[PDB]
Amino acid sequence: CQFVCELKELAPQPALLIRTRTTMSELGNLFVAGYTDILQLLAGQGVSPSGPPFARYYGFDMETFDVEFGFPVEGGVEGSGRIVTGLTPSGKAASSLYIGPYDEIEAVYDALMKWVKDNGYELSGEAYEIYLDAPAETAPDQLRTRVVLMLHE
Numbered sequence: 001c002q003f004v005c006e007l008k009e010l011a012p013q014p015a016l017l018i019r020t021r022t023t024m025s026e027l028g029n030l031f032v033a034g035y036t037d038i039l040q041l042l043a044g045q046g047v048s049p050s051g052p053p054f055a056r057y058y059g060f061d062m063e064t065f066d067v068e069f070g071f072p073v074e075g076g077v078e079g080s081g082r083i084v085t086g087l088t089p090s091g092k093a094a095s096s097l098y099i100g101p102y103d104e105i106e107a108v109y110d111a112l113m114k115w116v117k118d119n120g121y122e123l124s125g126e127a128y129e130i131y132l133d134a135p136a137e138t139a140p141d142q143l144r145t146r147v148v149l150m151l152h153e
């Protein structure tokens, strides 16, 4: 995990997001539809996202899990309906940059977990991906996602 993996201490950033329970079969259309309804709201308000979208994965129950996914925005933006105000995760974290298709992102979860065991830290359970590249616009072998495992201190 040399060079590639690093520890970080993260601050909450304000976001608009949707919190829901889903599986991996349904994630794709869910994110497409939800992210689009988020940008439609921000467009309607003249507000721009302050950064790339993300998803917080947690609540694992067999194939299912909860997820909060959205866009980070500036302070003072309000939601509507299913789009609620929220915050990015915070705390100590192990961060690595994954490049490749989402159906092979386990590659970096394995590595980020061995580097956690082999350095005497522990997981808080929840993961946090940041989608630096739009997958619609980006070759799958160039798709940049930052993978962030929240640690427990």
Ligand SMILES: CN(C)c1ccc2c(-c3ccccc3C(=O)O)c3ccc(=[N+](C)C)cc-3oc2c1
Binding pocket: 027, 028, 031, 032, 033, 035, 036, 052, 053, 102, 131, 132, 133, 134, 135, 136, 137
């Ligand atoms: C780096 N920026 C600017 C962006 C912008 C948009 C997306 C959309 C999206 C948003 C709305 C409509 C289509 C797409 C898409 O492109 O399919 C993503 C969609 C899904 C996604 N996963 C993790 C499944 C990840 C997505 O990441 C994005 C990143």
